[PDB]
Amino acid sequence: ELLKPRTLADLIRILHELFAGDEVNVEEVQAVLEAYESNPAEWALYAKFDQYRYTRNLVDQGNGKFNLMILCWGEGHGSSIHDHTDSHCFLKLLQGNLKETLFDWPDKKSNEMIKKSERTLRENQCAYINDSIGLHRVENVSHTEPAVSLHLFSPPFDTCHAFDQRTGHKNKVTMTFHSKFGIRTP
Ligand SMILES: [Cl-]
Ligand SMILES: [Fe+3]
């Protein structure tokens, strides 16, 4: 029975219930993420920015079932085109706006990766992707507003691929945490 999360802590408690088993009800998880109304005071601890690129800030390890993290995007910061390592990805906006550009998996032949579509994800909205759907790039294209997003990855993963938009060629990337549980982790 899905109830509205009252706070980030309540959300986390509900997520531990939704991931208690071995499968994932994507629509329920997305609905509860969307229903949490972002409260900046509740997540300020995790919102640690870097001047030069976006940061990944671990919030909860989901009793091993998921990584819940907060990504902090300075003005003009964005990601590579990337996959999600056979995991679910839920992305909820906590502050600002992000542009999500979708791409299909490349063919073996070296070719330009052409976007399928793009959209603007707005405060409190929750997007979903997995490798069966395709690849994406996420960007804060704002010149004046930092963005903050809440990401849930299940199962957790520490590597993925970045794709060269010019060729479709992929390279393995190891993701690093800027902080864990509010503590800077150099
Ligand atoms: Cl992502
Ligand atoms: Fe992603």
UniProtKB/Swiss-Prot annotation:
Listed GO biological process terms: cysteine metabolic process; L-cysteine catabolic process; L-cysteine metabolic process; lactation; response to amino acid; response to azide; response to cAMP; response to ethanol
Keyword Oxidoreductase belongs to the record: yes
Matches recorded under Gene3D superfamilies: Jelly Rolls (2.60.120.10)
Pathway where it operates: Organosulfur biosynthesis; taurine biosynthesis; hypotaurine from L-cysteine: step 1/2
UniProt keyword Oxidoreductase, yes or no: yes
Residues engaged in binding Fe cation: 82, 84, 136
Source organism superkingdom: Eukaryota
Gene Ontology CC terms, in alphabetical order: cytosol
Co-factor note (free text): Binds 1 Fe cation per subunit. Ni(2+) and Zn(2+) can be used to a lesser extent.
Cross-link 3'-(S-cysteinyl)-tyrosine (Cys-Tyr): residue positions: 89-153
Organ and tissue specificity: Highest levels in liver. Significant expression also in kidney, lung and brain.
Pfam families hit by this protein: CDO_I
Protein family (similarity comment): Belongs to the cysteine dioxygenase family.
Subunit structure as annotated in this protein's UniProt entry: Monomer.
Protein name listed in UniProt: Cysteine dioxygenase type 1
Source organism per UniProt: Rattus norvegicus (Rat)
